[PDB]
Amino acid sequence: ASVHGTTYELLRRQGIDTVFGNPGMNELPFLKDFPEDFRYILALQEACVVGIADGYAQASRKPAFINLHSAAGTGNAMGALSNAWNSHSPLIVTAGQQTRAMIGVEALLTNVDAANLPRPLVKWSYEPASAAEVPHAMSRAIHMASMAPQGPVYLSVPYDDWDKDADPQSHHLFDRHVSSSVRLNDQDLDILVKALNSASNPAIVLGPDVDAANANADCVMLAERLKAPVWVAPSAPRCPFPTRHPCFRGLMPAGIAAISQLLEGHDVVLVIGAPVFRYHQYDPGQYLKPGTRLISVTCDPLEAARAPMGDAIVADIGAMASALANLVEESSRQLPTAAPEPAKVDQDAGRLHPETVFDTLNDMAPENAIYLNESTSTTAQMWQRLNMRNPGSYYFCAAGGLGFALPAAIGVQLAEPERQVIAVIGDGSANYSISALWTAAQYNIPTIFVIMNNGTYGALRWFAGVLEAENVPGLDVPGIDFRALAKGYGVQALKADNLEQLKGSLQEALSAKGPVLIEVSTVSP
Amino acid sequence: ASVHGTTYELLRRQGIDTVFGNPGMNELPFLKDFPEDFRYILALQEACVVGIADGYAQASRKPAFINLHSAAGTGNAMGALSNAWNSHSPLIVTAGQQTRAMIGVEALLTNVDAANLPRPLVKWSYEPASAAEVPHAMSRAIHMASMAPQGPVYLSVPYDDWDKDADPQSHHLFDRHVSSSVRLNDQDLDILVKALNSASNPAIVLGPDVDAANANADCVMLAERLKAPVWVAPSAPRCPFPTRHPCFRGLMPAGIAAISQLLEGHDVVLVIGAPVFRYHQYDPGQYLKPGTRLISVTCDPLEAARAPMGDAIVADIGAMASALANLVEESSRQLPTAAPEPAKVDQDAGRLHPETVFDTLNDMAPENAIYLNESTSTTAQMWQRLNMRNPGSYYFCAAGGLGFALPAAIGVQLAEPERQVIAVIGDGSANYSISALWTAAQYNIPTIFVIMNNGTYGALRWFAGVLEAENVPGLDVPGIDFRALAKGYGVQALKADNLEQLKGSLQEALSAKGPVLIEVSTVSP
Amino acid sequence: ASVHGTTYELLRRQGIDTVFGNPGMNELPFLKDFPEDFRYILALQEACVVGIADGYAQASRKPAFINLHSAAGTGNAMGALSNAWNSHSPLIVTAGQQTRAMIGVEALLTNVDAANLPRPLVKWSYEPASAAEVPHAMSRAIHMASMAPQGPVYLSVPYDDWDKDADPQSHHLFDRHVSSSVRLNDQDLDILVKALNSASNPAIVLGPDVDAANANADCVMLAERLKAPVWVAPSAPRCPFPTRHPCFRGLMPAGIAAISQLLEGHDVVLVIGAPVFRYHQYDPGQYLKPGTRLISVTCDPLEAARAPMGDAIVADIGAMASALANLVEESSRQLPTAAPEPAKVDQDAGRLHPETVFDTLNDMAPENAIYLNESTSTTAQMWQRLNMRNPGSYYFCAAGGLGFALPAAIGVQLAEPERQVIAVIGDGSANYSISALWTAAQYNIPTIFVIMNNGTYGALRWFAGVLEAENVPGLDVPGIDFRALAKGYGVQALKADNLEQLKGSLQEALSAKGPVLIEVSTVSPV
Ligand SMILES: Cc1ncc(C[n+]2csc(CCOP(=O)(O)OP(=O)(O)O)c2C)c(N)n1
Ligand SMILES: Cc1ncc(C[n+]2csc(CCOP(=O)(O)OP(=O)(O)O)c2C)c(N)n1
Ligand SMILES: Cc1ncc(C[n+]2csc(CCOP(=O)(O)OP(=O)(O)O)c2C)c(N)n1
Ligand SMILES: [Ca+2]
Ligand SMILES: [Ca+2]
């Protein structure tokens, strides 16, 4: 068989049936004779291609396949690649390389030193030394992406390899099954269990790897057993817990001092599926107040090694959560009391306060909605005013890289056609990957886009104030008609200048059958 | 406290008490006020420094700490790092960098783009952005090297960082315990054990991670239970099974065809702590023959990803091995029959054959001896003729990089002062790190060095013969006097031109007080 | 044609006839049927292989070809490559890779991510995408090494490539001639010449690239016309100027403050072929005192960019030096004030002071001797006491990496059979590349090795002192017998325990036919 055929067989047999891409001259020899059991998803830009794939991989909890054009295409995606890395997304990035005979002369379309391009934002980057090796390298890439901790990979392949004769011994790759579903040995696990049952005032902290592992329900059972308060690790890329559950305590502020102070009083603090920690703002202080010990359970050796305090276990989050939830005894302590309901902010007949939007989104959206956030100045209000009962109901750019929510909201919706995806994106952030809108329309992927328009970078201006920094240029974004952009890419558009219009626009988008964008006028800071 | 104080406190609390090094100007501010509870092992050149630390780390099954000088020192040790990578040696390599104020002008001794230098032969590579961050980076290096899969790490530290004040929060890293002692979940583990129980003709292949995890005994119990034959994986850097056990079948040849042929007949083949496969010579064919199904247990995701066949499980070798040995049913099949005893080769009163040397060593060395091998052309005869009952009995350069055995043998002897270490080393390979001899004499480490002197790069002449390659230069190394080399570095020397002399020198060396080198006149190929 | 035949044809057509190597299996398909117009130099260890090739490349002023084994052999030589990078040595480093079919499975001997290995110490790292591209790749490596600024390059070749058919169009690369022999345009050169003519108190500073270009004599002319004092840039890897010329000022100490002080009062300071500057010891102060202007002529963009002060011109040192020597006016100023003569140090009949050794070498050695230095605590004294009036008379680890001088002194001597190489090497430094001696014996290369045995890492102890560092481990190296090491590798050995023995040993070694090692008992700094 050919490399072309042997490779499509490898993907098939590994459970791959979708290729998100933007094509070039180097990817043609691979894209040709596109099998009937595969489906192609075009995006007009590479950051969009990878963002859609990303959203898709995270929601489906399975690797996504990507096909990009040489260096220019690989480069245009590296922003999105930055987010994927931080979110442990299993992305198999494949880029086309110039014909082997033209690489030396560095002809146009030649990915020079290709393996180094994506570094250091990838787990594995490689260019095969021969055509016949392609299938095997594809196997490595697939498994390298899928193994815990999950992450994006990169494979460069000359477009002249696809027609070449594949190595018959390649068939051994087809049904290779690699497992990293592992957990702490019985002995050291019983000691951890013992320590948990002996804790007088334990707290729990959950990160994105919990939602990734669909370990959410096990973490609920674990929290209820231990009758422990639950927090989401700072800068959360996902939601690992029910926001209305009695134990839930909200999202931790992304600061050293704020976190140690919040943990003060708790003797044992168990962190699951989160870096320790994902700080953001400057808040020098004590990592942990005396009397508080920390135990981290991550699937990433890099997270475990860099943690400034506490002990760590490197195991699979799905396996560990399940074991712990089924091992720990039921504490007699009283079950924590659910946090009070956020008060309703005063709203006039003019511009809408972000608080009003969320309260409104929470009232009208189906219970199994899926929210994406890239309204940077309103993350706190969002996490508080949005009741998210189910797994994989929240997504936020994991390396803080803007341009992720728009496309990712498309990939998620594609992966979850039964759940209404609602992307909440600031007017600034909506520009980074605006072209992505075209994909939602072309394939009729029914994402509802909510654009919060403050005419500026609320977040940036804020930080500006927390630095007393005056005379900063480039913070305003006036003169952007999001309705016209939506029209440009064939997506139904709507506007809400007030609460009355907001309620109306939302009505009509949940009833609509295709993608819908709503530009909402929000107060300025 | 100073970064200096805090850093040594960290090393100490993490169980490190030994520094293997060759000092430079950028290392003195680190080395000054050397605490009494630490020991410093000086080697004359950096391949020797690392090699010794490698042997030490492998034998002790704990991280070894190394201190080298900037780029030139790190550079000199690169070859040694390639072996360490392949052998998963937990080595924390640190190099002195120019004072921060003089980095910009690239002053003499400035490690340019330092983190990139050792790549790609290290798990992690880093230079802290500030002095206060040194301790934390050191904590990372420590854990990144100890965690599975174990391997060398690299830390570059500007020499002015040591006197600066350390962060008071750094005390949290002192007692951080990180665990990767994990095994497959209960559900999937059951499936595996059932598969092993159901096998009609099982075979077991073992690699170096078995010996490193001291799982040798557990593997012995496993093979006794399944009554299946046991093989060591090709290009073995270690021995993880009694070479006299009834199940032991020896070192697999390092060829694709030869391995698939050996494995023909066995329905299920269990590979533990080894790559699949570490082939060497070009021997094209089938990876496996039909009827054979492969299951691999590895602690390194890189190995699981690049296996061209079989299923893989990524987990700690210790926990996995111990789990399987105490779970599998005891087959009723008849325990395999021990392999015959190598045949005695005809030996005249002249040049000694490698077979004779090994037979004499075996009939004279203590039962708990430890052997290192850098006698390239006689590896096969070595594995057949040495009885190695105990774990940690064999070391061989894991990436084939010559210059390992000699320093490593000193590192091992240092690690195991109660076990007589005997390094067998070709006349060719003895020169790569000849200078390490001095460390053996200086620190009174009684390692025995057997130099197999045939006057030529033997394994090279062999290969050249298989490739029908003619007129190849640089294969002969005449005119080296090893006794004179040993006298040069203060190491007692003896020579064995015949058997009588061999017996006598061996008896004298085993008795001698300090290190001893025997130059043996062997026959050529 | 095979890739093997074509590659060897390219090498000869490019002037290469020597291959410095340590063979491995991956390199055997390359070394086989070794052509009769080529010669192979074996060294027993990689750093020794590269070090010899380095000395050979620097002395001959031509690129040198290297053949090493996969990752491990490349790795062993990376310390030596750090020195070569700093000395702009044109070294073509080739390493054999596993057969293309066994790279994926990462068989033993596989060089993983090979091109990344020697980075950041190479101008170019590459592994070709196919067998037929090898020749083109070797062409690139050859030219990347030879083009200013010259440096080491790296090429990894799967061993199954050598037998495969080469592209017939590969013959176009045979006579390819690349030139970077360039100087500053006429208009901007005139402006520079005017600034030199108009200077009231100009000073000249010269680095290693001057000696590399053989621009020493043009610098002499220039220094004479400008009647300017001449200094060698700090951490000098080579000697760019007659040490006894009336203009010679000596070696600049490697300190910021020391240098601005030495340059005070000079209105214009012209630096040629050196980084600005290769400082060493922490010596904070003013880069340049006010009233002092700096002009740097370098062949390396990296050097011009990183200079903390001054204007820079990136051009060929050979051409720029020649143009300037022949363009400047002759000044009627008086020559620099004569340098004091270095004093004869107090010397008993016991252990030898470095200064006694240097004066004695200077008295007995031929006018055209070549000295290498890896005697780390005696460098300043060496420069004062050795009269080197010829080009290419001095070499010293350019990145400060020990293990250079001994192998390099062999490369140099091979390259200069008519000039007597004298390597002055510390007891510490001698160990990094001890096995190189074997190469001297085998090919009968008459290098003389002077081992300065003081029992200690002298420079370190000194630094420990200038730091007030107490209880530093590992500064002593007792119990090394260098006569034994020499015998071990088949090199004739002598011992100098005092002045009388030293004189006799030097006389004897200067008349010997093969290589000689002299162990000199010197006084310790203690
Ligand atoms: C690609 C990228 N560019 C720039 C930034 C820095 N940044 C963070 S928030 C922000 C403005 C976002 O404003 P908007 O999306 O309108 O939401 P708001 O902050 O107004 O709530 C910028 C530029 C980033 N995180 N990613
Ligand atoms: C650092 C390094 N250099 C070169 C090689 C290639 N090589 C492998 S075996 C060998 C000859 C070894 O000679 P000797 O130690 O005498 O063993 P023998 O083959 O003679 O038994 C060489 C040059 C290597 N593997 N590693
Ligand atoms: C590869 C390498 N290792 C270590 C050093 C640090 N170093 C610089 S000088 C020196 C002392 C060398 O001693 P020796 O050769 O006896 O000369 P001496 O100082 O006694 O004159 C050392 C270890 C270095 N520069 N390069
Ligand atoms: Ca030999
Ligand atoms: Ca010394």
Short mmCIF file of N, CA and C in Angstrom, two decimals, chain B residues 379-417:
data_model
loop_
_atom_site.label_atom_id
_atom_site.label_comp_id
_atom_site.label_asym_id
_atom_site.label_seq_id
_atom_site.Cartn_x
_atom_site.Cartn_y
_atom_site.Cartn_z
N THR B 379 30.85 -8.86 24.15
CA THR B 379 29.67 -8.73 25.00
C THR B 379 28.90 -10.05 25.09
N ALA B 380 28.78 -10.74 23.96
CA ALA B 380 28.05 -12.00 23.91
C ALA B 380 28.68 -13.05 24.82
N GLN B 381 29.99 -13.23 24.70
CA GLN B 381 30.71 -14.20 25.52
C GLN B 381 30.65 -13.83 27.00
N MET B 382 30.57 -12.53 27.27
CA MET B 382 30.51 -12.03 28.63
C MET B 382 29.20 -12.42 29.31
N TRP B 383 28.08 -12.22 28.62
CA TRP B 383 26.79 -12.54 29.19
C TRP B 383 26.63 -14.06 29.40
N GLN B 384 27.25 -14.85 28.53
CA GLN B 384 27.13 -16.30 28.67
C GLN B 384 27.94 -16.84 29.87
N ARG B 385 29.06 -16.19 30.19
CA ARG B 385 30.03 -16.81 31.08
C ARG B 385 30.09 -16.23 32.51
N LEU B 386 29.42 -15.11 32.74
CA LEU B 386 29.39 -14.56 34.09
C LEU B 386 28.07 -14.88 34.80
N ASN B 387 28.19 -15.53 35.95
CA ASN B 387 27.04 -15.82 36.80
C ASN B 387 26.74 -14.58 37.64
N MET B 388 25.60 -13.94 37.37
CA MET B 388 25.22 -12.74 38.12
C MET B 388 23.89 -12.98 38.82
N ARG B 389 23.98 -13.49 40.05
CA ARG B 389 22.80 -13.79 40.85
C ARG B 389 22.06 -12.55 41.34
N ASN B 390 22.79 -11.48 41.67
CA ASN B 390 22.19 -10.31 42.33
C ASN B 390 21.86 -9.11 41.42
N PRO B 391 20.86 -8.31 41.81
CA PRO B 391 20.59 -7.01 41.19
C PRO B 391 21.84 -6.13 41.19
N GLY B 392 21.89 -5.15 40.29
CA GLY B 392 23.00 -4.21 40.20
C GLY B 392 24.34 -4.86 39.92
N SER B 393 24.37 -5.87 39.06
CA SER B 393 25.62 -6.58 38.82
C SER B 393 26.28 -6.24 37.49
N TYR B 394 25.60 -5.47 36.65
CA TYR B 394 26.08 -5.26 35.30
C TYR B 394 25.75 -3.88 34.76
N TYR B 395 26.75 -3.22 34.19
CA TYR B 395 26.52 -1.93 33.57
C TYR B 395 27.25 -1.89 32.24
N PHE B 396 26.58 -1.31 31.26
CA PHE B 396 27.10 -1.22 29.91
C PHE B 396 26.59 0.11 29.38
N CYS B 397 27.47 0.84 28.69
CA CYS B 397 27.14 2.17 28.16
C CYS B 397 25.82 2.15 27.37
N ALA B 398 24.80 2.81 27.91
CA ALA B 398 23.41 2.65 27.44
C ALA B 398 23.13 3.22 26.06
N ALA B 399 23.95 4.16 25.61
CA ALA B 399 23.76 4.70 24.28
C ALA B 399 24.94 4.31 23.38
N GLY B 400 25.80 3.42 23.88
CA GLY B 400 26.96 2.97 23.13
C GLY B 400 28.14 3.92 23.11
N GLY B 401 28.03 4.99 23.90
CA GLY B 401 29.08 6.00 24.00
C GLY B 401 30.23 5.52 24.84
N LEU B 402 31.36 5.25 24.20
CA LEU B 402 32.55 4.78 24.90
C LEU B 402 33.07 5.83 25.89
N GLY B 403 33.73 5.36 26.95
CA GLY B 403 34.25 6.24 27.99
C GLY B 403 33.37 6.23 29.22
N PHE B 404 32.35 5.38 29.21
CA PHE B 404 31.43 5.22 30.33
C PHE B 404 31.98 4.29 31.42
N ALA B 405 32.20 3.02 31.06
CA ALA B 405 32.60 1.98 32.01
C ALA B 405 33.65 2.41 33.04
N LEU B 406 34.76 2.98 32.60
CA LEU B 406 35.87 3.26 33.52
C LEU B 406 35.53 4.23 34.68
N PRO B 407 35.06 5.45 34.36
CA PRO B 407 34.59 6.29 35.47
C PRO B 407 33.40 5.68 36.22
N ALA B 408 32.45 5.08 35.49
CA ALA B 408 31.24 4.56 36.13
C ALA B 408 31.61 3.50 37.16
N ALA B 409 32.67 2.75 36.88
CA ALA B 409 33.08 1.65 37.73
C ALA B 409 33.55 2.18 39.10
N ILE B 410 34.13 3.36 39.08
CA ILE B 410 34.54 4.06 40.29
C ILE B 410 33.31 4.61 41.03
N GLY B 411 32.34 5.10 40.27
CA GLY B 411 31.11 5.60 40.83
C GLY B 411 30.34 4.50 41.52
N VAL B 412 30.28 3.35 40.86
CA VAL B 412 29.61 2.17 41.41
C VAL B 412 30.31 1.69 42.68
N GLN B 413 31.62 1.46 42.60
CA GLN B 413 32.39 1.03 43.76
C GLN B 413 32.20 1.97 44.95
N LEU B 414 32.12 3.27 44.65
CA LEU B 414 31.83 4.27 45.66
C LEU B 414 30.43 4.03 46.23
N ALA B 415 29.48 3.68 45.36
CA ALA B 415 28.11 3.43 45.79
C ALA B 415 27.99 2.12 46.58
N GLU B 416 28.77 1.12 46.18
CA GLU B 416 28.76 -0.18 46.84
C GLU B 416 30.17 -0.60 47.25
N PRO B 417 30.59 -0.14 48.43
CA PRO B 417 31.95 -0.42 48.92
C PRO B 417 32.12 -1.85 49.41
#
